[PDB]
Design a protein around this ligand. Sequence first.
Ligand SMILES: CC(=O)/N=c1\sc(S(N)(=O)=O)nn1C
Ligand SMILES: [Zn+2]
Ligand SMILES: [Zn+2]
Length: 258
Amino acid sequence: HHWGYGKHNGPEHWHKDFPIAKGERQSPVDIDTHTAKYDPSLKPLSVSYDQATSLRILNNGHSFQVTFDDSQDKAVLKGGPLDGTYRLIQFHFHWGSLDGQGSEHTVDKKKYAAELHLVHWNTKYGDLGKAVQQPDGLAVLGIFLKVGSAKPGLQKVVDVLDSIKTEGKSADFTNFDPRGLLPESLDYWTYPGSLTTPPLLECVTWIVLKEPISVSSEQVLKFRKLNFNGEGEPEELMVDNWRPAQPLKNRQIKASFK
Ligand SMILES: CC(=O)/N=c1\sc(S(N)(=O)=O)nn1C
Ligand SMILES: [Zn+2]
Ligand SMILES: [Zn+2]
């Protein structure tokens, strides 16, 4: 990709090829707890990942991503702020050059060590391609990572990262259960926003979980061994692959909990 996260191709440059970068509904945002008010009309989130079928894990040059078979309603997200049903297509992470930063969303300006994004598309639009053209096309479930005890459900992921060090490497990754990446509580904040990488389309209902998952320092250090560059190219270490908080502008963030 021509775009990246460095001085010369990072988030400050993106608007030149993707003008919507300066749009009215851009993500991520800061979640200000004084103003993210409880809404009693919000429903409990429904996560049904039991039949999730993972396929591949890859380094795409901006993150590492695990893909899923989205051909039927195997793993779906519904309820919450969502009308209808959204199929899981992939998850990936954003992380920092140190434990003190790396998340895209912030909470009262505080940055977590990383952020997991589980990406889902609205089945009423037929496929991902048409879905991304609709303001309610995607639902992304965002989960913060803090450094603490190890997350057993992340171990299968951490264990193959050394085999996909550079951009374009990938590996077989079947039978991975994404339920193992979820915290205890499904309490959430929600707001209308965008994809946080190009093309930055404003097609996302964001659902950000209040409770972070804990991963061990040992686990998150493996994230930081990845490279933005392809094999044979000059080394550019994949850290700080997060877009900074964008202005909330005229939007409202709602909380599912008090
Ligand atoms: C196909 C697809 O899921 N693209 C995505 S997911 C995403 S993110 N970082 O979850 O908001 N950004 N983009 C461009
Ligand atoms: Zn890409
Ligand atoms: Zn993301």
